[PDB]
Amino acid sequence: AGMSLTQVSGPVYVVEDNYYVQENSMVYFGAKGVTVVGATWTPDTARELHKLIKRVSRKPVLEVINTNYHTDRAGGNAYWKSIGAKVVSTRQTRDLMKSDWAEIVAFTRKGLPEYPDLPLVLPNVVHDGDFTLQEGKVRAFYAGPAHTPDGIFVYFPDEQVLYGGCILKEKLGNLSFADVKAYPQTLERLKAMKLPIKTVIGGHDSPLHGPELIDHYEALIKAAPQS
């Protein structure tokens, strides 16, 4: 299908969004409603995700997290706002989105001319630090710059699942925005947290991995140009 939504553990589901360059995002089905992690590529893809969510739960979509300011993590924002879902990010992500959205949309359209010229839609719930949702069962944190300066991790302690967003994935990918020297330093700060991790969800390529995805990408990035 163009998009799938599949349980990985309990209330934690993975979205494989096959539009444009495949991106993987998360959904958490909570007591009071649904938290989406990664807004997906466009308002149309967001609508496609919402359609899958409505086949699983009647509960409202409470909030959507932009794990960085880029199109693959924030492009759905217009749709999520339109349905009354909060759009959540760190202050850093919101500030970079305000200044650099036009730039990332233009860069997106270089590779994907078919991608729409989306207007800026900023998060409306902004956090100054690390933050949690769903009674502490969805935990977002900053551990330094990697694919972008602002990208955050999201951890689900009950299921021991770590969402890597654009930071963790199978192939090196494009490094145009990346801090290549800091990248492994961020991954090592992450490892030093010693979070219990059974599953890492990569934000591109095939999503389901073990904790060794962190080590896999770390070795890749340490070999890259500008490392």
Ligand SMILES: [Cl-]
């Ligand atoms: Cl329901």
Ligand SMILES: [Cl-]
């Ligand atoms: Cl439910």
Ligand SMILES: [Cl-]
């Ligand atoms: Cl353009």
Ligand SMILES: [Cl-]
């Ligand atoms: Cl990121």
Ligand SMILES: [Cl-]
């Ligand atoms: Cl592998």
Ligand SMILES: [Cl-]
């Ligand atoms: Cl694996």
Ligand SMILES: [Cl-]
């Ligand atoms: Cl791996």
Ligand SMILES: [Zn+2]
């Ligand atoms: Zn990006």
Ligand SMILES: [Zn+2]
């Ligand atoms: Zn990405």
Ligand SMILES: [Zn+2]
């Ligand atoms: Zn793997």
